[PDB]
Ligand binder design. Sequence first.
Ligand code: HEM
Ligand code: HEM
Ligand code: HEM
Ligand code: HEM
Lengths: 142, 142, 146, 146
Amino acid sequence: SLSDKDKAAVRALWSKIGKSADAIGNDALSRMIVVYPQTKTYFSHWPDVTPGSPHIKAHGKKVMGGIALAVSKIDDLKTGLMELSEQHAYKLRVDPANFKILNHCILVVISTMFPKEFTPEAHVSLDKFLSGVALALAERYR
Amino acid sequence: SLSDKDKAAVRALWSKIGKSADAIGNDALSRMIVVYPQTKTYFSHWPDVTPGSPHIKAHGKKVMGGIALAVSKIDDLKTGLMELSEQHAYKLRVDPANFKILNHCILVVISTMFPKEFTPEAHVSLDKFLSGVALALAERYR
Amino acid sequence: VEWTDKERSIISDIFSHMDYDDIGPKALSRCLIVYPWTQRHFSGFGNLYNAEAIIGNANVAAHGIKVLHGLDRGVKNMDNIAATYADLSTLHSEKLHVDPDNFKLLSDCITIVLAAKMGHAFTAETQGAFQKFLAVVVSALGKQYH
Amino acid sequence: VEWTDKERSIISDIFSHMDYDDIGPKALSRCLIVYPWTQRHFSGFGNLYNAEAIIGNANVAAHGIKVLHGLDRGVKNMDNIAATYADLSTLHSEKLHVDPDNFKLLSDCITIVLAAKMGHAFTAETQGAFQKFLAVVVSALGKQYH
Ligand code: HEM
Ligand code: HEM
Ligand code: HEM
Ligand code: HEM
């Protein structure tokens, strides 16, 4: 669970980097599909499964939109992400192991783009947060 | 998170198999150390880190007493297992990834011992439950 | 992977006594229930939004037997498992778009269903060898994913 | 492991330009803070009660440098990494009793720290090669645990 310290840390970092959510999204989804190409399986309905492609760019927008959503719903991520959980469970059937992969890639992305803001303290809190997002997204699965 | 459905299924199963907790603990820890020898790193202070050893046998009793507690605290595992979290976090420094390993071993043990009771529905609720157990033990770590 | 003689013997014994038409449907059924995202690849097999509808499903039961028999070639090709499964891996990746993590999950379900059938004979050493085998076959099935 | 020439090039490029005295302490500090159970092995290191203590601990600093330079042998032996690390594997298992999962955690911390240093230059491809290299080293460091 996230303590008040953790929530304030996530809120403060997102206050700082939120402006760049779209670019963070493209960079993270791009890293996911190149470094972890097994993930491309979920996007076979797209011809353009390649770093920075139009479907990846536009999609990265939606995903970090979901993270901004999670930041606003951080006191209750289960309730907050229930609709997104339903989407990944029944429409998308995404194995929850892949949330861990994307979470690593987002951390890597933020480290590249905000090294000063991404302190070890920011990191442990955001990692706890993203693990919590991952747990909430699995809510409707089984 | 566990639904009423999940809670009912775990309680129902533990009602049936709880009297065998001691034997399940021995079996589960024995498999863990045999199948996943890296977990032995946490038992370096025992001379007999072998399957069914006096030390593994007695410890298995205590681990399943731990699972017994969790079933009794199923409505609030974070609170219920706080002391165990503090001990695994502050005293033992057990990487929480190992909880997933022991969890799989418990499921294998229960399938070998209680085939009629361990139905696929009992399985999904118990696996959900053991993952909640792992997260609850993870609580005091960071 | 370097196999020991005991390991080859355990796997050999297990597959020679394997009731495939029993274990295969059970392991895939349990996978589809415990890990319901694996239902991604079974759409037209019928309605499996239920455990009893899953367990009663013949298309599902027929695919569990095939999949279990997909292990036989590794049993015979124990020192050539990556090469032997290369075609199957490429099929699952480019044809079927199967997330390879699902192979691990199914593998755990087969272990658990096999553990229930074998009971006390499914010792710690037996489970180690059997999981070792599946581990190598799972590596092989995910190897040609690009 | 199969290395491509471009993977070899990237690994070489990264380590020839690595400031070990900067990245090493940063990565081990980060690991101890984000994954505090790794502190299990640093009881003699002085104060670690909170992040600032760890970032400020000169002993954690010199060990991070040592661990980072421990990678040098695999760069210098890309095709024989399992063998090259066998003695280190045996050491970590029998004398230090370090959980090998912690190797993966420190690895990811090294990647995230290198990513902050390299910035925009740490491309996805760069990441893929660097992670691949670390994954092959970690595999090797866990190999002698029995
Ligand atoms: C940080 C974790 C994640 C978040 C916040 C997230 C969020 C989202 C959002 C906001 C959408 C679009 C909603 C809509 O259009 O109705 C979406 C769709 C989708 N997501 Fe996720 N997701 C995450 C992780 C993943 C992962 C790990 C994968 C697979 C590897 C995945 C695969 C998909 C796919 C395939 C779709 C549909 C895209 C399309 O068809 O264009 N998601 N997700
Ligand atoms: C299902 C999750 C687990 C539960 C419920 C659990 C439960 C417990 C309990 C109740 C004790 C206290 C025993 C006593 O009173 O002396 C204990 C101790 C301990 N646990 Fe766990 N445990 C779990 C997972 C693990 C794992 C996965 C490991 C390592 C791989 C581990 C390592 C230890 C060790 C090293 C001790 C101290 C043993 C001794 O020195 O006597 N635990 N655990
Ligand atoms: C132990 C792991 C597995 C083994 C050994 C295995 C083996 C096989 C084999 C031998 C085939 C026949 C291919 C052909 O049509 O020529 C097959 C087909 C198939 N498998 Fe796998 N499989 C495994 C896991 C999975 C998983 C986890 C899934 C999905 C979640 C999956 C879904 C399929 C599908 C959809 C087909 C094609 C069916 C068709 O012909 O329409 N398999 N498998
Ligand atoms: C990238 C992964 C790692 C590599 C390449 C590595 C390499 C090394 C090297 C080169 C040594 C010194 C050899 C000697 O003095 O005999 C060493 C020792 C040691 N390592 Fe690791 N290491 C790694 C990860 C870790 C982790 C994750 C930890 C625990 C959290 C750890 C704990 C230790 C300890 C406690 C020592 C003993 C040194 C002393 O007594 O001062 N190492 N390792």
